[model samples]
Target chain A: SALPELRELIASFVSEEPPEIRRIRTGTVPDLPGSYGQYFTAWDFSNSIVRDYAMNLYQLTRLATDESVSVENLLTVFRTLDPIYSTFLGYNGFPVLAEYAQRVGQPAESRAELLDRLTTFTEYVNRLTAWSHHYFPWDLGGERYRYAAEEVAAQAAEASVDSLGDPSQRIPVRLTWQPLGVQVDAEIYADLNPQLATDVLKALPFTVLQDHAVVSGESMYAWAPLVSVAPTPVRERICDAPVGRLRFSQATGNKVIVQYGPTTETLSSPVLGKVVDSHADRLAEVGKAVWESTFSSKEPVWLTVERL
Target chain B: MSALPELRELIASFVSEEPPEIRRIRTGTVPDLPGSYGQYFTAWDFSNSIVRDYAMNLYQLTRLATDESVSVENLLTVFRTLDPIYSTFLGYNGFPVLAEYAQRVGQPAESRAELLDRLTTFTEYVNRLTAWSHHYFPWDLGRYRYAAEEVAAQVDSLGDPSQRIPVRLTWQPLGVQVDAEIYADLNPQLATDVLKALPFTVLQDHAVVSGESMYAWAPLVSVAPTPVRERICDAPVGRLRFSQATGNKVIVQYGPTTETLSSPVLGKVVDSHADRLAEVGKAVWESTFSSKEPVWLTVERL
Candidate 1:
């Protein structure tokens, strides 16, 4: 039933018609009744906010590279979309639905069904989680019980795996224990063009500087930004639309300024399609055409193109 | 001839020297004691846990915040002083201590002693009934059985406001957000019965109770299956904290996720009584959290 609706929504992107997207806000529990509040509907990838954000992202990605363009109008577009990600106090969850569906070989429908929306997002999320395992190492006796640790100090290295295995001794407790939870402090730097910065933030999912971190002897997941942190920075990167790399560092201390750049380009895959043209004239034509006609509209977009 | 008055004086003297905040410390419990309704996370445990955590959190927090040199053993002395009021909710109706006191006094049932005992119990449990109530009473609606003026007059008429702390308690499973609207629909009188019972509510949100299915506990389905207490509290809590060692916010694992908080001490968790601490996360650890329990924590908000 939603397939046709999805097709229509997706088609709205390509049609040379000016469309006003009506945004709706609904607070839904990912878990209902007997369910608790963990599965956040607002954070779901298929959430309407994400859909709207992605739609705006498509438009902004095209406008970023050019020097002469005014991003004010597009900035208006972001004001409507960023709230989907930012206004909420927390981050999204693992792309369980997407990853599971892919593994089971049940292809998700194209934006039409909630399954499709969630699955697509879940794939994006799993990719980020996979990246975390690749980038950081974790210690584990069991699955969810695993933790992120490495031998930074020498005492840790000479320590036996048995001794290290016991977190009480292995895990250092702060004597002056004070917790400053995970913070996503993003500073998007781009060459004079403000839209380029917008492009970078929009391309990735979730917030970078602000994430969940644990304190004290409390359990690890006892903090915010609970899922993988790799997605935090990846979500802040511009996925190869040629915007200046704004290095992401979740580093808390200012003492060691360790900056990280994205190791892989998300948009380079053959599947994502090519970047649209960079020129405002050409970009405006696409935008104008999209605004002016539906393929089935009585006034042909050819006339609009001719006027442009 | 004066049983209720004598009992009231005895109890009041005990309470004057002791408080719930103090008693939580000296009190002890056997690990995993089976309680009422045969439920693992029964109201009794809920009462104890809150008493313990509130005292523990407050005491430790005060020490930490003030940089005051205090030993945990010394703190226990402070805790013992509060024991009389420690399990107000538990002793209120279940025990006849107050009823006996009323019987001792000539006033019997109509005496102020009897009324105070009942009122105190109601103030603790009925006010926030959801946590320990056998039935769901819609107290979240905020409609009160005792009118505001009556409560104020009573406070002025009898006890000080500080002692008359309307300590409220309520509980809901993890990953479940209550609709303030649906909650408002509860019968006000029954709701009032709950509000007067407890001071602070215990939320079962984000973590499951053992024997309570995932369908019964919404947060369980979203989480990796190994859920814990700290995760749920940190998730939707108004405030959050983070650790640098673990790159992610612990709350991400704590709040509203299937992830569990592991404790090397007691080698257990302080989370949803929903699943077997040992068994709940077995598959979850095997599958999610990278087939390995990642040290979880929240990141500091930048």
Candidate 2:
């Protein structure tokens, strides 16, 4: 009954996920419970907090990065919708029933009948465990354990894989930082605004200093006026968007912002690219380390973005 | 009792402004054998299982953290059980008492979860009874040495609660936390027949049956003319018994028998305290030999 709705929700969620994170989330126990061995055994993905930060526009522009307000508001939305609010506490179990149902999926009245407004949330998450075969490490020995990891991949991989393969679909770029001696690989989708991606790619390798490398919430944002692209109409504005999205807004004079942690792109702009899944945490560290050191050191760390 | 007491504190330190990339834990398990149920994470096993669990609990702003598989049933109860045993353990600094029992009894977790979800919850006790009783009687005290300065009660009384008798013990510290135990597995009639004399009193002995290890037996509480030395082979710790094969003699074991003959099990001194039981047996030995300074162990029911 809830199968199609579950599939659509899983589909959108996977659309936003990195290829590597999708691989390791196989419905199999990748590592023994007590082995202290490598978990996932593939690519490292950010916990749901950072990953879900910039998911939709509300989290991108409106969600408070300040913890005191963040947690209450977070629960206000999830506590009612989520049946397994407990699982939401774990590494990857981010519970959102109504949010995804309404925000992303093609909703049906069955959504209300089958999934909305629940009990101890136990019923909802356990139900999700059964609905979608994308299981967590703890679910390996559970009652509903199933080896549908391969089946799930077959359903989710097509759009993302084919989309990334199309050159006209995305503009991949590499950002290098001289001061920190690091390079971040990114992909700027022209879906929001083709002109911005075209201009940045045409300019090729160019240098620009990081402006306002300040930390906010779980992310850090520095509006670097990198290229000659002018900001279009309000393409996208966010509150506490997920980390890793490399955004561009020329409205504030070629404004370009990036956060290695949670995304903090509160203003409207076209997302130029995003850090690869493998380097998301490292980038967040880059942003946050600069945020902290800004107080003591005369000059905190900074960055520059250019097409590699 | 458990190293989780130490690990949770350590995890928070690393997690303050960082991700839940929890640090490795090398310690977390019961120091001794599992007291009543079982232990969770063990010592010296480096793992992120507990790390991730605690991080989620902390970040989620909940206290139900730990490596225990929090099933739906588990969640329902933790949030339901009122006034949990380790209520402050995860937030403050203490260990969850009776954690294992929550999984088996399967009541506390959901109860606590209910409590967390809704502001109002009923109540459950620490040890099911100990803490519940503690609410009424926090001090579970046993013996108090007589100052001998004022052992007798005044002839007359005063106003209500003025019945506050003068302190009897040589010096009673403030009323305390732990209580005592008096055990006997004697035949129902014989054990009750012990009601024959002092009705509610028994004087413990200081006589050492053997010094290979410390042990003391209560003198015959029944007011029959009694003061005899009977010996048996070795005995179990806390084994208290009176042998019909012999006579009306009973013996109690403190430490294990290094070398000593013992008797049949009548009842046991289940209320043994390791810290004071040694001195208790030593004092029993001294009192058995000391004529001038006789001490009455407070086996008096009250």
Candidate 3:
């Protein structure tokens, strides 16, 4: 068996490379008017599996401290995940496209073509979902669990890992919005654990209105600020009540502003002119699955298990 | 017909979904370091292909723009190239790893196991090699190539195409070192053409030698002064001068610096160490391939 020092050495090199963060700002699509609530969205994956994968990797890196886990290992995982993530996003952005093509009678000629796309999409989702247990696991009732978030906040308190004074203090808040190609097993999870669904809904930052909220024109043009600014205090409050609120300005008004911890990533959500709320199933699937899986994982340790 | 205009058109056609305007704003300028590399690497990879595929996709996208049909293969050439780039940088980093229980604590001797270890690192190494080119800054390369043209004009009868030359390279001197060997092996006709065509080039290895003492801690900093800055620069930096050599390697006529420290960066190193043309002579005489075991060399030109 490896000595404790060896284990520690191996763990140091086994870090999770931070996810590639690219802020994308969308302009109004041609022929589409801004009346849609200046909806902002990224075109990556809407699947919670993808997000959970990265989160799990992040948690793993945090837990591991052995040098035996080399930078190459971190990079390897990052590199593999990067392309796969992109492929999944590519698939996500164009989900159901084949069906549309088939209805239009215009998809790739072979049945294999349609099947290939489906297979690719399935592969990514499967991998992502399989690993979901690391971050958001299902409570026995199958509803979203708060365990991960609670543990993180609790650990931050004990460790005194406050980001308020030290901007460099690692705070965990990432905003990824891919509204296509995702469906949560929310009904199942909620049925299993009603409290989880209730807690997640309460934790959600946006004030969902029943009235029609139309975002368009320069308003469609103005998305960067609106989205990014609101989530931090809520997540922080889940951990430490002392967390601060975001300061916004006229410049931030129209943008979809997502502020996580100390850092802020902004870009206007694309005004696809397509109604975003219409994809309720897609949105809830990713979110509900995330709420359940990430909070429910039993393995306290998630990344680079030094098998030495 | 122009490459840039053609590239812009292709990108517009294939891109069905625009990132939220907020996200597009960050893509305006390439950051110094690709932080949040996970996200940056993908867009950079996909879009880079569109730029290259401009030539291939010109008519195709226009015809298919309204068709709603996309060909994944058009972009696959570069996707396969991704394999090489990933492997090169993959050192200790990727999947499908083979672990030998015995080789854990100490460096393995060169038995079959050692060979396997070296070879194991190969996949990621290859991946990095190809990917590096895609990840590199094209704009900076333009500047470096332009500088090379100006200097090459001094020595050669011909010049490389305005578009193809490399610019702002990290291992400028090492590139020159490699070029010297390539120059020797060129066919008779090709040799004369190369000698006369865009011969002057900058070589630097600052990325390797930075703040390091191994090469006299001479951080190889080489740049042609402001007169060298082309149209792209807003404020020209004048310290730049065309060196016959950059880093430890010097041009044939120029001599070497007497300073103990040699930098991969061409400029900061003392002038005496600038021209070590003789070292190339010895390197050329030696074999290029070092076999299964890697060979390393550091020379002080006499």
Model 3 chain A worst lDDT window (10 residues)? A209-218
- The runs of at least 3 residues in candidate 1 whose Cα sits more than 4 Å from the true structure, single-residue gaps closed, are A1-6, A12-25, A29-34, A37-268, A271-308, B1-302
Ranking by TM-score: 2, 3, 1
So what's the TM-score on candidate 1?
A: 0.17
lDDT of 3 by residue, B35-90 (tens): 12122332232232222221111112122222212222211221222222222111
Candidate 2 per-residue lDDT, tens place, A161-184, comes to 223334567667777664677778
Candidate 3, superposed: residue stretches over 4 Å from native: A1-202, A205-308, B1-42, B45-120, B123-127, B134-270, B273-302
Candidate 2, B1-302: lDDT as tens digits: 22123333432332122212111111212222111111112111112211122222222223222112333443333332212212322111112332332223334434444423222111111211211111111011112122233222100111223222111111012121123232222233444434232222223332221231322122221212112212333454544444321113334555543222333333334343334455555544443333313333333322
- Two-chain complex of model 2, DockQ on C-alpha atoms against the true structure: 0.01
lDDT of 1 by residue, B1-302 (tens): 43224433443333223333223211222121112111222223233333322222222212221222423322222222222222322332232242232222212234433433432332222112211121121111111123334323320222232322222111222122211110101223322222232222222211221111111101100101111113332232111111111111111122233222221110111234323322333322222212222211111110
> Each model's TM-score?
0.17, 0.23, 0.21
The reply for model 2, stretches above 4 Å from the true place, is A1-168, A211-234, A263-267, A293-295, A300-302, B1-302
